[PDB]
Amino acid sequence: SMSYSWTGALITPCSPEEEKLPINPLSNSLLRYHNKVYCTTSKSASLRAKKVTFDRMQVLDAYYDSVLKDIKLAASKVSARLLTLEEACQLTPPHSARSKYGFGAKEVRSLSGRAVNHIKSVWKDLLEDSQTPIPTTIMAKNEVFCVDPTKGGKKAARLIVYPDLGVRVCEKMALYDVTQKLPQAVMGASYGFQYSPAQRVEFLLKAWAEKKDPMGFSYDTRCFDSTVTERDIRTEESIYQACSLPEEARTAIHSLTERLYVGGPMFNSKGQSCGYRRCRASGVLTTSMGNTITCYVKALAACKAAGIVAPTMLVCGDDLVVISESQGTEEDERNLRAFTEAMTRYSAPPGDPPRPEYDLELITSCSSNVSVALGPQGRRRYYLTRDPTTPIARAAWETVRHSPVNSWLGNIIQYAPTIWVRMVLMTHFFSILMAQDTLDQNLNFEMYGSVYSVSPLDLPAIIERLHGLDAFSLHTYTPHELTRVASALRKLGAPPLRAWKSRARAVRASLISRGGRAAVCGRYLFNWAVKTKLKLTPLPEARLLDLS
Numbered sequence: 001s002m003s004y005s006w007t008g009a010l011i012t013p014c015s016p017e018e019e020k021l022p023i024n025p026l027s028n029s030l031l032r033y034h035n036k037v038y039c040t041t042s043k044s045a046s047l048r049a050k051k052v053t054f055d056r057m058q059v060l061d062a063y064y065d066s067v068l069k070d071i072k073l074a075a076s077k078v079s080a081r082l083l084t085l086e087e088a089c090q091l092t093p094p095h096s097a098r099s100k101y102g103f104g105a106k107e108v109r110s111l112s113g114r115a116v117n118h119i120k121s122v123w124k125d126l127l128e129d130s131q132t133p134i135p136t137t138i139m140a141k142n143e144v145f146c147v148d149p150t151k152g153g154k155k156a157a158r159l160i161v162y163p164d165l166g167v168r169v170c171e172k173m174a175l176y177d178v179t180q181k182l183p184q185a186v187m188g189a190s191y192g193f194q195y196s197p198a199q200r201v202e203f204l205l206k207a208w209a210e211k212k213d214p215m216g217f218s219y220d221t222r223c224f225d226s227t228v229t230e231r232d233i234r235t236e237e238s239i240y241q242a243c244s245l246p247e248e249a250r251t252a253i254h255s256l257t258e259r260l261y262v263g264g265p266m267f268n269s270k271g272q273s274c275g276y277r278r279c280r281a282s283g284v285l286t287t288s289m290g291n292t293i294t295c296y297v298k299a300l301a302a303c304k305a306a307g308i309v310a311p312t313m314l315v316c317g318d319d320l321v322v323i324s325e326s327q328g329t330e331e332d333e334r335n336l337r338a339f340t341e342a343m344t345r346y347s348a349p350p351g352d353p354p355r356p357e358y359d360l361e362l363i364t365s366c367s368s369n370v371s372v373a374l375g376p377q378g379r380r381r382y383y384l385t386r387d388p389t390t391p392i393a394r395a396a397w398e399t400v401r402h403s404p405v406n407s408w409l410g411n412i413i414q415y416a417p418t419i420w421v422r423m424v425l426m427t428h429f430f431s432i433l434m435a436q437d438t439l440d441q442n443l444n445f446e447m448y449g450s451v452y453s454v455s456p457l458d459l460p461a462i463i464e465r466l467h468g469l470d471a472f473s474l475h476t477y478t479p480h481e482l483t484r485v486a487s488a489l490r491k492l493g494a495p496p497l498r499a500w501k502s503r504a505r506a507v508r509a510s511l512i513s514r515g516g517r518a519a520v521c522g523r524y525l526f527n528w529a530v531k532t533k534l535k536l537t538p539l540p541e542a543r544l545l546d547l548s
């Protein structure tokens with residue numbers, strides 16, 4: 001019932017935390033320098049704790065039972081296997097939090113004796129004990145945002161809850177295969193984490209077009225992880241158990257469910273007993289899959305209870321969008337409140353109350369929205385974009401504080417066709433790379449299921465294969481997109497687009513002078529920066545394929 005119980009001990013940091021940069025070399029233009037970026041820290045952990053701690057009142061109904069029945073039948077169609085200890089170790093990222101048992105990710109990836117033996121006892125313990133809660137560490141996340149004076153004060157840090165490295169590897173052995181198959185099997189096209197930007201755009205355009213009179217809305221659950229109940233989490237296990245699994249996997253899955261997923265004790269970085277959790281833990285293997293399926297079940301049942309007409313939904317964890325047949329504004333709003341009231345009963349109360357949308361460009365899904373622009377031939381071309389405030393705020397931060405994994409590279413790749421990536425991020429970072437003289441250096445970035453390594457000098461080929469040549473010729477963006485980008489730059493205290501356009505010229509010429517791949521990057525990535533455009537032909541793009 002209560003999402004959390006606290007002892008009073010503080011959520012302590014592990015390393016000295018930095019909340020502001022000494023100098024922001026992106027929010028700078030000769031006579032106008034600013035620094036409105038900030039990073040969340042332990043200091044606001046108590047504030048977040050207060051926010052996520054509340055009573056959950058859950059009451060299900062026939063609409064829910066029905067949808068749950070359908071989902072379990074769909075789940076019975078899946079077969080999954082145990083992952084080999086070796087396979088689970090190999091899936092352990094290079095720097096994931098070390099264990100308190102004398103080893104780190106390095107030792108797990110190389111299968112050192114100490115690590116392997118420890119992992120084996122943890123697995124054996126899971127098979128022998130299905131009751132003893134597994135301890136978790138709770139910590140404040142350090143994430144970068146931009147102050148938004150109008151929308152409110154700085155955001156409190158998100159809280160991360162995760163078990164020891166040894167337990168994490170065992171989770172993969174028992175459930176990794178399931179996480180790669182179950183969501184799509186029960187949700188199909190509605191499973192949002194299966195689409196590339198072009199496919200996501202296509203799904204949305206298609207869903208919108210099939211309605212005679214389309215109406216969409218995004219539903220935002222206030223603190224989704226805190227809203228999922230113990231019942232929800234055991235119900236997730238019953239959905240997992242519907243799959244065809246080896247008895248050994250079933251045992252570990254039940255143990256992991258009763259000892260970890262359903263809840264458990266939390267300790268701060270100092271080892272002090274911090275509290276007890278009775279909701280979703282942010283740092284466990286099943287978080288993404290669990291949230292996605294549970295959000296889908298509740299959302300679909302709510303659609304039925306509210307009488308939403310012909311709903312086509314897209315779900316990304318707790319992020320949900322529903323596009324259906326409009327019944328007129330008056331009726332749509334009535335239907336949306338019924339939907340909300342149903343979601344609430346299912347323990348999925350709304351943060352920002354949902355409102356009907358009748359312009360596709362204004363609907364945000366999985367943090368993005370569809371927009372339109374013209375191709376070199378003058379025809380319309382759709383693409384995925386998003387508010388650039390946070391991506392740029394972080395790009396600025398990662399300019400000073402070099403981090404192992406860059407977010408800017410990821411944003412450039414995922415949003416390559418956007419005007420903000422093209423005029424700002426590409427111009428800025430290629431200028432920085434030439435200044436540091438590290439152009440061909442391979443960098444690591446993330447697309448949330450992996451950490452990739454790529455050389456910026458390979459961006460034109462990567463972008464072509466990912467978004468097509470049109471990514472280098474898009475023009476005539478919408479005023480909504482232009483206004484949003486311009487507003488983000490103001491909030492950030494960064495130079496306006498007209499200034500970046502001037503800068504792009506120099507960056508382009510500098511890249512060309514260097515010849516080679518650098519020249520290709522210049523001619524292709526910045527063809528928008530010169531009045532007399534170069535032609536631009538297909539590249540050796542037909543030589544690669546991505547997973548994420």
Ligand SMILES: CC(C)N(C(=O)c1ccc(Cl)cc1Cl)c1cc(-c2ccccc2)sc1C(=O)O
Nearest residue numbers: 418419422423474475476477482497498501528
């Ligand atoms: C109207 C022309 C001059 N234009 C472009 O050619 C252009 C297209 C794509 C990219 Cl990535 C960059 C540029 Cl400069 C455009 C200039 C714009 C602009 C420039 C400075 C401030 C605000 C908007 S918006 C815009 C467009 O085609 O949509």
